[PDB]
Amino acid sequence: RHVVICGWSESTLECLRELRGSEVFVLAEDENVRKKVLRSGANFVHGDPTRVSDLEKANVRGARAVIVDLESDSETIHCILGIRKIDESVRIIAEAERYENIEQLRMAGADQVISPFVISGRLMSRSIDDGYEAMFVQDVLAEESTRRMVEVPIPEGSKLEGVSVLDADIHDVTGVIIIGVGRGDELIIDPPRDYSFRAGDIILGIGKPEEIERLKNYISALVPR
Amino acid sequence: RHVVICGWSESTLECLRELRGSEVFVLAEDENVRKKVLRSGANFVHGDPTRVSDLEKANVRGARAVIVDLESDSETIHCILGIRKIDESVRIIAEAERYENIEQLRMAGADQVISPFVISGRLMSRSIDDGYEAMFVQDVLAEESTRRMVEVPIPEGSKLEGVSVLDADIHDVTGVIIIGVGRGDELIIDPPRDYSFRAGDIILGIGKPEEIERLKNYISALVP
Ligand SMILES: [Ca+2]
Ligand SMILES: [Ca+2]
């Protein structure tokens, strides 16, 4: 199991740091970065992320995911198109440089498009009086963070299958704040009364590590007599 | 009140979208971006963001905050230093596209640094299996969305002065989920039931527009 990164930028550098301990391959046109990629804990492949043969050389086929961030959005689109020819099942995550290009990255094949500047502009507008929201968005997104945002799936046979958020009382049992539930293509915030947890749901929660393990055990199957 | 933006890029373009309604002044060297800044709803000031005289021309003194978004690392620093020569009472928020320059920005006196690529890279690493965490950022930050994150300050004279979060029962009363409370320069995520609110505390919550305005009224002042 392994991850592929197309393009080397400050974003994919940050990405790789977060992937410490996992197998990762980086594909870029600049040979000069090999040493830093290596010390950053990835395997480096010198080549062109828009050319199929090179994406293939970088183990895109059967990758757990491919992360793409080339210098322009048109290069990123071409890489996306090349990846899809190789493997139609592989998850593709793409950074967009300019807002007007977001849908074209999706149309090309990205399962998800991240727009650093859109996120930045939004935080900027929220940071006029203080920095607490940016404090928050940084306090949670980092793996190294103490109290972090985590995803925990509702397993098959869960205690909570068919049970609503109110009956669940997760925050009392576990200490975890439920900030969302990921189901199918949608993320639901503050689920209403008529929401029941279904196996396969992804709980987006915030909590210290021991509160997280508490949640995981809590949502398990009823142990019969 | 008014806000000043030094520089222009995709970041400040999006920023203006969420500031439509505010008086915003954009100061930038590239005359070519006037038309776009104007359509975006800000007033355009042509000039040099590193220069005290042009920063003053852009209404920096007395400004609620200045946002600095310059391609040059060294210019960002000189911009920060120029603002501070004009008015130390201004909140300064600076964008860093290079991690290397963050400490230089703080040394110069930036109050806050935003690093788009740290957030982006972290979101990339959180998105290997699914995109829910990044969806939580698209959904919650776009002020033009259904259920967003809001800062609501506790006004002096608030009904909730000295009132504990358990006793406050905010989520039950208003529908807003409390994520954290900010006091001073610390953000307390998920404050314990016996934490007592104070004027000047900033409640971080997520809710619908009506829940939010419900919370603003709930914590409103006692105005005899
Ligand atoms: Ca990039
Ligand atoms: Ca910038």
UniProtKB/Swiss-Prot annotation, chain A:
Give start and end of each RCK C-terminal domain: 137-221
- Gene Ontology cellular-component annotations: plasma membrane
**Which Gene Ontology molecular function entries are recorded, alphabetically?**
identical protein binding; metal ion binding; monoatomic cation transmembrane transporter activity
Q: Where in the cell is it found?
A: Cell membrane
Topologically, how does it sit relative to the membrane? Multi-pass membrane protein
Please share what else the UniProt entry notes about this protein. It is not known whether calcium is the physiological ligand. Inhibited by charybdotoxin (CTX), a protein from scorpion venom.
Q: What does this protein do?
A: Calcium-gated potassium channel.
Q: Domain comment? A: The channel is composed of 4 repeated units, each containing a transmembrane pore part and a gating ring part. The gating ring is composed of eight identical RCK (Regulators of K conductance) domains, in an alternating arrangement of one domain from each of the four subunits and four from the intracellular solution. Two protein interfaces between dimers of RCK domains from the pore-forming subunit and from the intracellular solution hold the ring together. One is called the fixed interface and the other the flexible interface. The flexible interface forms a cleft where calcium binds.
Q: What is this protein called?
A: Calcium-gated potassium channel MthK
Provide the gene name from the record: mthK
